[PDB]
Structure 1
Amino acid sequence: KGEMNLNALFIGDKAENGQLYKDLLIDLVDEHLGWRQNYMPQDMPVISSQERTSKSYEKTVNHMKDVLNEISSRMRTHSVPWHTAGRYWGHMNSETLMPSLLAYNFAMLWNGNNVAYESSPATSQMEEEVGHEFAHLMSYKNGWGHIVADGSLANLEGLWYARNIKSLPFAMKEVKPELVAGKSDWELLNMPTKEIMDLLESAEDEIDEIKAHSARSGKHLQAIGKWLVPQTKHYSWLKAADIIGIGLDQVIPVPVDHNYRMDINELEKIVRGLAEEQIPVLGVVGVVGSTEEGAVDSIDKIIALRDELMKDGIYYYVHVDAAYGGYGRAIFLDEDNNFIPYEDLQDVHEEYGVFKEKKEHISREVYDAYKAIELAESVTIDPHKMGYIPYSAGGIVIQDIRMRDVISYFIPALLGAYILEGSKAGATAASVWAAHHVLPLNVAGYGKLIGASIEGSHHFYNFLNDLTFKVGDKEIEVHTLTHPDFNMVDYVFKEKGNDDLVAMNKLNHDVYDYASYVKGNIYNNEFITSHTDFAIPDYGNSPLKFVNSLGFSDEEWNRAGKVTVLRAAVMTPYMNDKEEFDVYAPKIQAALQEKLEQIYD
Structure 2
Amino acid sequence: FLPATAFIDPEGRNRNEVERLVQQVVDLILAKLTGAAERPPMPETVDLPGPITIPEAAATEATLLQAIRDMVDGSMNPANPGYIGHMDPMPATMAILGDLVAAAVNNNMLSLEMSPSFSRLETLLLRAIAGLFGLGEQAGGVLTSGGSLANLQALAVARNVAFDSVEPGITGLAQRPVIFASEAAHTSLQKAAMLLGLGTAAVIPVRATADSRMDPEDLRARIDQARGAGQHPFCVVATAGTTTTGNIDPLAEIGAIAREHGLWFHVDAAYGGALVFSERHRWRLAGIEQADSITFNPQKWLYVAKTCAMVLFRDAGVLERAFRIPAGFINLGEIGVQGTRHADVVKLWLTLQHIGQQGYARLIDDGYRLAERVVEGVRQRPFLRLAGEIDTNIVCFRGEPDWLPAERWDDWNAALQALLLREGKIFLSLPVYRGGRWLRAVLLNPYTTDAVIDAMFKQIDRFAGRERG
Q: TM-score, normalised by structure 2?
A: 0.82
Matching of residue 212 in structure 1 with residue 117 in structure 2: no
**Residue of structure 2 in register with 1:290 after alignment:** 242
Q: Structure 1 591/71 Cα, relative in aligned 2: closer, same or farther at 3 Å?
A: farther
SS of equivalent to 1:286: strand
Q: Structure 1 304/455 Cα, relative in aligned 2: closer, same or farther at 3 Å?
A: same
Matching of residue 419 in structure 1 with residue 336 in structure 2: yes
**Residue of structure 1 in register with 2:54 after alignment:** none
The alpha-carbon deviation at position 452 of structure 1 amounts to 1.8
The alpha-carbon deviation at position 381 of structure 1 amounts to 0.5
The alpha-carbon deviation at position 73 of structure 1 amounts to 2.2
Q: Structure 1 398/71 Cα, relative in aligned 2: closer, same or farther at 3 Å?
A: same
- Correspondent of 1:152 among 143, 148, 162: 148
**Residue of structure 2 in register with 1:115 after alignment:** 110
CA offset digits 1:502-521 (Å, max 9, x no partner)? 111110011123345xxx5x
SS of equivalent to 1:529: coil
Matching of residue 588 in structure 1 with residue 461 in structure 2: no
1:287-326 alignment runs, 5 A limit: 287-307=239-259, 309=260, 314-326=261-273
SS of equivalent to 1:117: coil
Q: Is the 8 A contact 2:155 2:192 kept in 1?
A: yes
Q: Structure 1 292/48 Cα, relative in aligned 2: closer, same or farther at 3 Å?
A: closer
Q: Is the 8 A contact 1:222 1:246 kept in 2?
A: no
Unaligned runs of 5+ in 2: 1-6, 21-56
CA offset digits 1:486-529 (Å, max 9, x no partner)? 1110111233433x22111110011123345xxx5xxx752211
The alpha-carbon deviation at position 45 of structure 1 amounts to 4.4
Q: Is the 8 A contact 1:89 1:528 kept in 2?
A: yes
- Correspondent of 2:233 among 276, 281, 285: 281
SS of equivalent to 1:293: coil
Q: Is the 8 A contact 1:125 1:411 kept in 2?
A: no
Q: TM-score, normalised by structure 1?
A: 0.65
Q: Structure 1 586/134 Cα, relative in aligned 2: closer, same or farther at 3 Å?
A: closer
- Correspondent of 1:478 among 384, 388, 397: 384
The alpha-carbon deviation at position 237 of structure 1 amounts to 2.5
**Residue of structure 1 in register with 2:441 after alignment:** 568
Counterpart residue identity of residue 366, structure 2: A
Q: Structure 1 490/50 Cα, relative in aligned 2: closer, same or farther at 3 Å?
A: closer
CA offset digits 1:539-586 (Å, max 9, x no partner)? xxxxxxxxxxxxxxxxxxxxxxx22210001112345xxxx51x3344
Matching of residue 229 in structure 1 with residue 181 in structure 2: yes
The alpha-carbon deviation at position 387 of structure 1 amounts to 1.5
Q: Structure 1 275/440 Cα, relative in aligned 2: closer, same or farther at 3 Å?
A: farther
1:19-58 alignment runs, 5 A limit: 45-47=12-14
| Matched-pair identity in % | 21
Counterpart residue identity of residue 64, structure 2: V
| CA root-mean-square deviation | 3.1
SS of equivalent to 1:385: helix
**Residue of structure 2 in register with 1:453 after alignment:** 367
**Residue of structure 2 in register with 1:492 after alignment:** 398
Q: Structure 1 74/379 Cα, relative in aligned 2: closer, same or farther at 3 Å?
A: same
Q: Is the 8 A contact 1:378 1:397 kept in 2?
A: yes
Alpha-carbon distance in 2 for matches of 1:51, 1:296: 49
The alpha-carbon deviation at position 445 of structure 1 amounts to 4.2
Alpha-carbon distance in 2 for matches of 1:432, 1:373: 22
Select the structure that is richer in helix: 1
The alpha-carbon deviation at position 91 of structure 1 amounts to 1.0
SS of equivalent to 2:267: strand
**Residue of structure 1 in register with 2:214 after alignment:** 262
Alpha-carbon distance in 1 for matches of 2:92, 2:467: 38
The alpha-carbon deviation at position 588 of structure 1 amounts to 2.3
Alpha-carbon distance in 2 for matches of 1:501, 1:135: 47
Unaligned runs of 5+ in 1: 1-32, 54-59, 172-210, 333-348, 350-361, 469-476, 536-561
Alpha-carbon distance in 1 for matches of 2:173, 2:278: 39
Q: Is the 8 A contact 1:527 1:592 kept in 2?
A: no
The alpha-carbon deviation at position 157 of structure 1 amounts to 0.7
SS of equivalent to 1:530: coil
Q: Structure 1 531/50 Cα, relative in aligned 2: closer, same or farther at 3 Å?
A: closer
- Kindly tell me the number of residue pairs found equivalent between the two proteins: 424
**Residue of structure 2 in register with 1:183 after alignment:** none
- Correspondent of 2:97 among 97, 102, 110: 102
Larger radius of gyration: 1
Alpha-carbon distance in 2 for matches of 1:50, 1:219: 59
